């Protein structure tokens, strides 16, 4: 149990789950910013 408490809920249930959704928002926002940069048509 001392070996397996490394994977223990140190930061609590609410924070671990929220962090996951925060990273989801971060990753998705990175995705549309990068795709809008690649997809923009500056040239006439």
């Amino acid at each position: 149990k001392l070996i397996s408490t490394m994977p223990g809920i140190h930061l609590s249930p609410e924070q671990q789950q929220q962090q996951l959704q925060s990273l989801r928002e971060q990753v998705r926002t990175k995705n549309e910013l990068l795709q809008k940069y690649k997809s923009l048509c500056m040239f006439e």
Binding site: Q26, T29, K30, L33, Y37, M42
Partner: protein, 37 residues
């Protein structure tokens, strides 16, 4: 001579519009980088 002068005034402002576009793009990238925090 007058005609020759017009040539350069036609050439210019294309670099200016490209420059304002790329400044807008880099400002947007910097803003996104600071807001993602």
């Amino acid at each position: 001579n007058h005609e020759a002068a017009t040539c350069l005034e036609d050439v210019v402002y294309r670099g200016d519009m490209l420059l304002e576009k790329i400044q807008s793009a880099l400002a947007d990238i910097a803003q996104s980088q600071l807001k993602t925090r």
